[PDB]
Design an enzyme around this catalytic site. Structure first.
Site, PDB file in Angstrom:
ATOM      1  N   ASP A 164      -5.831   3.072   6.135  1.00 19.50           N
ATOM      2  CA  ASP A 164      -4.642   3.906   6.046  1.00 19.50           C
ATOM      3  C   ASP A 164      -4.677   4.965   7.140  1.00 19.50           C
ATOM      4  O   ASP A 164      -5.748   5.454   7.501  1.00 19.50           O
ATOM      5  CB  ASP A 164      -4.543   4.560   4.667  1.00 19.50           C
ATOM      6  CG  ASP A 164      -4.487   3.545   3.544  1.00 19.50           C
ATOM      7  OD1 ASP A 164      -3.826   2.499   3.720  1.00 19.50           O
ATOM      8  OD2 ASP A 164      -5.107   3.787   2.488  1.00 19.50           O
ATOM      9  N   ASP A 182      -3.729   0.843  -5.291  1.00 19.86           N
ATOM     10  CA  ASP A 182      -4.553   0.108  -4.340  1.00 19.86           C
ATOM     11  C   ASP A 182      -5.753  -0.563  -5.008  1.00 19.86           C
ATOM     12  O   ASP A 182      -6.501  -1.295  -4.359  1.00 19.86           O
ATOM     13  CB  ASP A 182      -5.031   1.047  -3.232  1.00 19.86           C
ATOM     14  CG  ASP A 182      -3.897   1.846  -2.618  1.00 19.86           C
ATOM     15  OD1 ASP A 182      -2.776   1.306  -2.518  1.00 19.86           O
ATOM     16  OD2 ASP A 182      -4.125   3.015  -2.240  1.00 19.86           O
ATOM     17  N   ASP A 187      -6.765   4.740  -2.363  1.00 20.36           N
ATOM     18  CA  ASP A 187      -7.141   5.993  -3.010  1.00 20.36           C
ATOM     19  C   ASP A 187      -6.607   6.089  -4.436  1.00 20.36           C
ATOM     20  O   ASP A 187      -7.230   6.704  -5.300  1.00 20.36           O
ATOM     21  CB  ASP A 187      -6.647   7.187  -2.190  1.00 20.36           C
ATOM     22  CG  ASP A 187      -5.143   7.178  -1.994  1.00 20.36           C
ATOM     23  OD1 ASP A 187      -4.548   6.078  -1.988  1.00 20.36           O
ATOM     24  OD2 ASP A 187      -4.553   8.269  -1.843  1.00 20.36           O
TER      25      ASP A 187
END
Ligand SMILES: C/C=C/C/C(C)=C\[C@H]1C/C=C/C=C/C[C@H](C)/C=C(\C)[C@@H](OC)C/C=C/[C@@H](O[C@@H]2O[C@H](CO)[C@@H](O)[C@H](OC)[C@H]2O)CC(=O)O1
Ligand code: NA
Length: 994
Positions: free
Chosen positions: A351, A707, A703
């Site tokens: 990310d 996910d 996080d």
């Protein structure tokens, strides 16, 4: 009701058939509860038990070694000697390792936490509901809640189930959907329906998801879904259905076990085929029971010789010592096997925000209209200094400091940035620096207003705390913040209705200050601000606006542009429907363009080298971001994922684009894509599936709970230290500092460990191969036993275990990041490497058997015997005349076995030095390089002397102390192993490396 968000409040009540005032009747409660079930995630059953121990004894080798214990136990009791404690040692030590080795594999208690159990921490214990049996509200267990229930929620309350909001009792309702989104910004909810049936959870502004908690407000709604049907429940079922594969190394060890079983099984048949001549012998020649003792006591030796009993203990100690190195380098690795497979990482999906960037948002540039006149048009660009939330900076035009207050356009620029802003600054005394309060984006606008100082307030006289919100507070003195129109992804903007204070500041009634995405705001602007005056939004002007915004986003600056507009003649306070979120865009129309501000999310300080480090290491890096495709690509070019000037049209996609592609082209895109912008929630796991289809070890990162499925499915699940617990428990690794560099830094350690790990694996196997040759030579030829299984175990466990464990501290072979990733289906030993340790194993087998044969025949203290009668030792009592010198017990003497064992131990100490480096000569690489290896070798030989000196030991090992006369012969036969291996190393570098 899965699509309750799209249905109106009247429709949801009609479906379940419940009155909003009364609630579900106890009869309905029985029906709904028995139909939809309890509101709770399924207890993760199918856990471990005694069956977990059974799983360790499922393989073939483990059964062969177990069989060796059973056969040994049979031969243990059957013996004439009146020896006591030494009786049950052979089958005893086998169980010790079979139990110990099983405990290591069963060790999934302290080295692996549960992810689904951590997910159950979000579902509350009790919840409020309105039932028809009573009037007042009554709190019950969250599990007792069913779909159709008229539930109630207030501030601080943890949402029990997925609820369709019916009526908001408070002024405004805020919820913290951090776990189901990521943004800590408590989103505002409403009652009106969302037209899109397959809208994302972020768009469902009329739903309260389970696990979420109300940040502020109070409301009442109907329960749409419960249990596994909730958003949390659907994420849970994805994790439960996801099966984690085992690291490629583990598959090689299981594969080696199957091969090693065939080897042991084949040799046992080979030994039986060599003694096929006993068919041509008399029945009265002796007893078959004596021959069976040889067959059985040999087979048990084969199982012990072939198997590297110490291997599991060696790797467990190495990887455990590798875990501490991971922790020091900011990498909390979950499981032990994860440290090795980390080096085999071929792809790293990361990310942008937080990992690749510092998340220190700061406005760098900003422009306003200088003046407009026909086809002509000129802007007014500026630049801000100080990449931080602190107000310690200044504004300058063309690299020259200026007073921001002298520009009327900048005055309103700071006004909009101050008013249309829910965030603020806060000076921290403990840390000693300015901290942010709210969003990183909005705090940057707050900081900008402090730097500009458009109204020229005293700054030097103020304190450190008063400096925080000085200029922003001065703006709030002019205008009164009536109300704000919440941000939404449908229009991508935010406005704020403001009224002037009682002082008559030349304000035209009330104003609306818009803030949002450039393309969206500019289109709704029919006017343009020019300091104080106003002109109509012409074509040529609109071109200059979007052109500069295009240059800032696409250029090397890589700025997140944000257009600021104002509504001079907004609708009256009464005409505006404050609840309808859809009408907000219509209220933000007929705007006057004020200016644009460009901010940057600064890339990490070390990602420049870390990315380039992956380029050499052959590891593919894919960026996942929320920025648009244009800026996302520009950011990729900046950090190193892309070149400054290369084609990347098909190497980068958006969420919209990738989703539109067919299933085949989606897979085709994942093998070349290096950047995904505006990614959907489920797209992370999809990319992992396509990456896994190419047999590629992927490393996805996240996080939040969103996910979790992607992390669970990915080979190397990476979570952030600041991330939620569910993300941590689901991931294989946890970044301590939330840095992309610490990923590569860990990956580099993973390869280094695997190289050292693969080294001592060949070392132990080399010893095990020699022990098999020693047994086969002394058995096929018909010689007296050279080595006892009790001895071989102590050799593999201790004497070979200590140095093998010490080989884990071998110096890292430099230029390791220059080579590509280790292939998933790459063999441990193959080609030349097989022949290399085959010859080494072949020599030790002849050396140990020859060492024993030396004492039997050509010895100093031993008897003067020949070879032809030495092979006929089993006929000592039978053929009396041919054998005559001493007692027949001399054939079963302790001396010759001590020679065979001492030669075996001495060579492994030398072979351990050969394992310092794979091909580098001992001339190049000093034997004293690895100090821990020398310490282990000194400890090993010290233990070797211990089992010969301290009387209690040698009687059990069947050994007898050797003097300097006998030790000399051991060194003469052992040391030559180094020269032979040195030759093999020399042949490898010369006539092979090309
Ligand atoms: C490879 C990384 C594993 C991590 C780890 C923490 C521990 C590993 C290290 C592995 C050693 C393998 C040696 C091969 C050799 C032929 C077998 C022997 C001596 C065996 O003794 C005859 C000992 C095996 C003990 C290990 O057993 C596990 O049994 C499981 C069920 O079959 C397999 O799934 C595992 O495959 C990798 C396997 O390791 C105990 C264990 O967990 O040890
Ligand atoms: Na996983």
């Amino acid at each position: 009701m899965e699509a309750a968000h799209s249905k109106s409040t009247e429709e949801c009540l009609a479906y379940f058939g419940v009155s909003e005032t009364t609630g579900l009747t106890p009869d309905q409660v029985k029906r709904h509860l028995e139909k939809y079930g309890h509101n709770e995630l399924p207890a993760e059953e199918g856990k471990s038990l005694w069956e977990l121990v059974i799983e360790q004894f499922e393989d073939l080798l483990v059964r062969i070694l177990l069989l060796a214990a059973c056969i040994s136990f049979v031969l243990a009791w059957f013996e004439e000697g009146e020896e006591t404690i030494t009786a049950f040692v052979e089958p005893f030590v086998i169980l010790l390792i079979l139990i110990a080795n099983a405990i290591v594999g069963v060790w999934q208690e302290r080295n692996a936490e549960n992810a689904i159990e951590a997910l159950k921490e979000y579902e509350p214990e009790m919840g409020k509901v309105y039932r028809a049996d009573r009037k007042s509200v009554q709190r019950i267990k969250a599990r007792d809640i069913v779909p159709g229930d008229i539930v109630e929620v207030a501030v601080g309350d943890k949402v029990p189930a997925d609820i369709r909001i019916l009526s908001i009792k408070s002024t405004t309702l805020r919820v913290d959907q951090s776990i189901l989104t990521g943004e800590s910004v408590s989103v505002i909810k409403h009652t009106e329906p969302v037209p899109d049936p397959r809208a994302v959870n972020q768009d469902k502004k009329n739903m309260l998801f389970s696990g979420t908690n109300i940040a502020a407000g109070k409301a009442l709604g109907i329960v749409a879904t419960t249990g596994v049907s909730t958003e949390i429940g659907k994420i849970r079922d994805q994790m439960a259905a996801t099966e984690q594969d085992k690291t490629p190394l583990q598959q090689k060890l299981d594969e080696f076990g199957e091969q090693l079983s065939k080897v042991i099984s084949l040799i046992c048949v080979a030994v039986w085929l060599i003694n096929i001549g006993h068919f041509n012998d008399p029945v009265h020649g002796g007893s078959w029971i004596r021959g069976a003792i040889y067959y059985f006591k040999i087979a048990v030796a084969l199982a012990v010789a072939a198997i590297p009993e110490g291997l599991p203990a060696v790797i467990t100690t190495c990887l455990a010592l590798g875990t501490r190195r991971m922790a020091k380098k900011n990498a909390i690795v979950r499981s032990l096997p994860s440290v090795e497979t980390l080096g085999c990482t071929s792809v790293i999906c990361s990310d942008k925000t937080g990992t690749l960037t510092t998340n220190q948002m700061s406005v760098c540039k900003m422009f306003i209209i200088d003046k407009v006149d026909g086809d002509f048009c000129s802007l007014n660009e500026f630049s801000i200094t100080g990449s931080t939330y602190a107000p310690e900076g200044e504004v300058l035009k063309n690299d020259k400091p200026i007073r921001s207050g002298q520009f009327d356009g900048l005055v309103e620029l700071a006004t909009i940035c101050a008013l249309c802003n829910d965030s603020s600054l806060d000076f921290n005394e403990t840390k000693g620096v300015y901290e942010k309060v709210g969003e990183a984006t909005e705090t940057a606008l707050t900081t900008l207003v402090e730097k500009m100082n458009v109204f020229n307030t005293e700054v030097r006289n103020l304190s450190k705390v008063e400096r925080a919100n000085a200029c922003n507070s001065v703006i709030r003195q002019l205008m009164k913040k009536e109300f704000t129109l919440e941000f939404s992804r449908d229009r991508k903007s935010m406005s704020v209705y403001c009224s002037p204070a009682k002082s008559s500041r030349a304000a035209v009634g009330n104003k609306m200050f818009v803030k949002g995405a450039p393309e969206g705001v500019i289109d709704r602007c029919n006017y343009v601000r020019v300091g104080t005056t106003r002109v109509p939004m012409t074509g040529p002007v609109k071109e200059k606006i979007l052109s500069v915004i295009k240059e800032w986003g696409t250029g090397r600056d890589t700025l997140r542009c944000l257009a600021l507009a104002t509504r001079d003649t907004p609708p009256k306070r009464e005409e505006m429907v404050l609840d309808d979120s859809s009408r907000f865009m219509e209220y933000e129309t007929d705007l006057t363009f004020v200016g644009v501000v460009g901010m940057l999310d600064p890339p990490r300080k070390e990602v420049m080298g870390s990315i380039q480090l992956c380029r050499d290491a052959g590891i593919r890096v894919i960026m996942i971001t929320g920025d648009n495709k244009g800026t996302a690509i520009a950011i990729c070019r900046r950090i190193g994922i892309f070149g400054e000037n290369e084609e990347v049209a098909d190497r980068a996609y958006t969420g919209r684009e990738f989703d539109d592609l067919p299933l085949a082209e989606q897979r085709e895109a994942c093998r070349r894509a290096c950047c995904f912008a505006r990614v959907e929630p489920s797209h992370k796991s999809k990319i992992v599936e396509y990456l896994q289809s190419y047999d590629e070890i992927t490393a996805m990162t996240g996080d939040g709970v969103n996910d979790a499925p992607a992390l669970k499915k990915a080979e190397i699940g990476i979570a952030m230290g600041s991330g939620t617990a569910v993300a941590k428990t689901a991931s294989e690794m946890v970044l301590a500092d939330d840095n992309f560099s610490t990923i590569v830094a860990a990956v580099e350690e993973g390869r280094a460990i695997y190289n050292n790990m693969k080294q001592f694996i060949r070392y132990l196997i080399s010893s095990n191969v020699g022990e098999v040759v020693c047994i086969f030579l002394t058995a096929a030829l018909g010689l007296p036993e050279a080595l006892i299984p009790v001895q071989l175990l102590w050799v593999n466990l201790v004497t070979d275990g200590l140095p093998a464990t010490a080989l884990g501290f071998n110096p890292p072979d430099l230029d390791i990041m220059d080579r590509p990733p280790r292939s998933p289906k790459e063999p441990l030993i193959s080609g030349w490497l097989f022949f290399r340790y085959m010859a080494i194993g072949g020599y030790v087998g002849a050396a140990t058997v020859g060492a024993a044969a030396w004492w039997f025949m050509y010895a100093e203290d031993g008897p003067g015997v020949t070879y032809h009668q030495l092979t006929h030792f089993m006929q000592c009592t039978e053929d009396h005349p041919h054998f005559e010198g001493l007692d027949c017990e001399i054939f079963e003497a302790p001396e010759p076995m001590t020679m065979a064992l001492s030669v075996l131990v001495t060579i492994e100490m030398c072979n351990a030095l050969n394992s310092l480096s794979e091909n580098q000569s001992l001339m190049r690489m000093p034997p004293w390089v690895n100090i821990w290896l020398l310490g282990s070798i000194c400890l090993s030989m010290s233990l070797h002397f211990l089992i010969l000196y301290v009387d209690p030991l040698p009687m059990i090992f069947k050994l007898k102390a050797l003097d300097l006369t006998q030790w000399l012969m051991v060194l003469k036969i052992s040391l030559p192993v180094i020269g032979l291996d040195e030759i093999l190393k020399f042949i490898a570098r010369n006539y092979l490396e090309g």
